[PDB]
Amino acid sequence: GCCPAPLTCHCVIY
Numbered sequence: 408g409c410c411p412a413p414l415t416c417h418c419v420i421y
């Protein structure tokens with residue numbers, strides 16, 4: 408999964 412922000416899947420905060 409990408410970021411929950413959500414943000415680009417290159418950031419993925421998880």
